[PDB]
């Protein structure tokens, strides 16, 4: 039970963070941050400066 609901919640958190980065790139930042890698449920990697 812990494995199933912990894995789902953590990948949900990663999906929320990816959606937030797409909001920041579209609205206010824009090429000051870029998504390098995104594997859904596995990893997210952003590039600044």
């Amino acid at each position: 039970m812990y494995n199933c609901l912990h894995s789902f919640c953590l990948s949900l958190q990663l999906e929320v963070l990816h959606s937030q980065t797409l909001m920041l790139i579209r609205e206010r930042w824009g090429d000051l941050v870029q998504v390098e890698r995104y594997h859904a449920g596995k990893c997210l990697s952003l590039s600044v400066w």
């Binding site: 494995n3 199933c4 894995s7 789902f8 990948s11 949900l12 999906e15 959606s19 859904a40 449920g41």
Partner: peptide, 25 residues
């Protein structure tokens, strides 16, 4: 006499949960 349209991503995550954790009767 709704659906907030961020549910595509949640649904793909549900399918990944189905695969990563299968149901067991």
């Amino acid at each position: 006499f709704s659906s907030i349209f961020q549910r595509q991503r949640v649904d793909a995550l549900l399918l990944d949960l189905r695969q990563k954790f299968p149901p067991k009767f």
